[PDB]
């Protein structure tokens, strides 16, 4: 493509692109060590095989939860903020925000580590939910995650203190309508002057289509193993694909921008 990786660095450096919307998947969490529940071999698939789970989709299936929610609360426990660090790929993003460049961070993830990298609540669109806030699956009463963290860590299934319903974190489950925060896509995507897709496979809709809601003057960037999604069916005149490992692409990109030392110090500060 006429546009390289440096070009995308230089535009940012010169401060041409100042409101970068970023679309992140599970590609950035791999090197934090987030074990894939599905993967017949990961750290969490072995513990959930003793548990009642026919297919991996079952955990975020609402019906199946009501029969047996403990594999969700065994997952959640394994994910509850404290287990895992963020890596370079988050601290890069946080540095966008620190440098007044991040418009919005749309994320598929549920591991909480964007916020851990010190991004505010407002800059995020946790598309498949969060392990921050809860909501009772009968009376709908909202609770702080702390309330219902005490129960998960102890091997108790949380239940609403008023109505006794099983209190469920605000993870989105297969079928559930996406958080009202998602509605921001309407404003952010046509209001973006840089698209940055960090480690996501782009299979599922809607999340993919939003790649096209940007404006055709706008460059779309993709750091990922391979060229997937609506870049791989409808590329455009300003697309670039850092095709390879996500981390090293983030390490090259950082360098071509000239945020080595500030990346070097940030990460030293935060950890």
């Amino acid at each position: 493509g006429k546009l390289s990786l440096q070009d995308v660095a230089e535009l940012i450096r010169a401060r041409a692109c100042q409101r970068v919307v970023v679309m992140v998947g599970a590609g950035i969490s791999t090197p934090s060590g987030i074990p894939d529940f599905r993967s017949p071999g990961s750290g969490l698939y072995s513990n959930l095989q003793q548990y009642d789970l026919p297919y991996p989709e079952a955990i975020f299936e609402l019906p199946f939860f009501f029969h047996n929610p403990k594999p969700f609360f065994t997952l959640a426990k394994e994910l509850y903020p404290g287990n895992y660090k963020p890596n370079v790929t988050h601290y890069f993003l946080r540095l966008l925000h620190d440098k007044g460049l991040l418009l919005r961070l749309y994320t598929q993830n549920i591991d909480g580590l964007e916020r851990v990298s010190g991004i505010p609540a407002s800059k995020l669109v946790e598309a498949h939910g969060t392990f921050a806030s809860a909501t009772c699956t009968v009376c709908q009463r909202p609770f702080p995650g702390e309330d219902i963290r005490a129960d998960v860590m102890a091997d108790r299934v949380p239940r609403c203190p008023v109505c006794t319903g099983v209190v469920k974190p605000d993870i989105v489950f297969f079928g559930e309508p996406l958080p009202q925060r998602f509605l921001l896509h309407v404003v952010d995507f046509p209001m973006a002057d840089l698209l940055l897709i960090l480690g996501t496979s782009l299979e599922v809709e809607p999340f993919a289509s939003l790649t096209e809601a940007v404006r055709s003057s706008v460059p779309r960037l993709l750091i990922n193993r391979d060229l997937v999604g609506p870049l791989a069916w409808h590329p455009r005149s300003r697309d670039v694909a850092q095709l390879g490992d996500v981390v090293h692409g983030v390490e090259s990109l950082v360098e071509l921008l000239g945020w080595t030392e500030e990346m070097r110090d940030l990460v030293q500060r935060e950890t």
């Binding site: 498949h128 989105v172 489950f173 297969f174 079928g175 559930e176 309508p177 996406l178 998602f182 809607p206």
Partner: peptide, 4 residues
């Protein structure tokens, strides 16, 4: 519209 936008469900998971």
């Amino acid at each position: 519209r936008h469900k998971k």
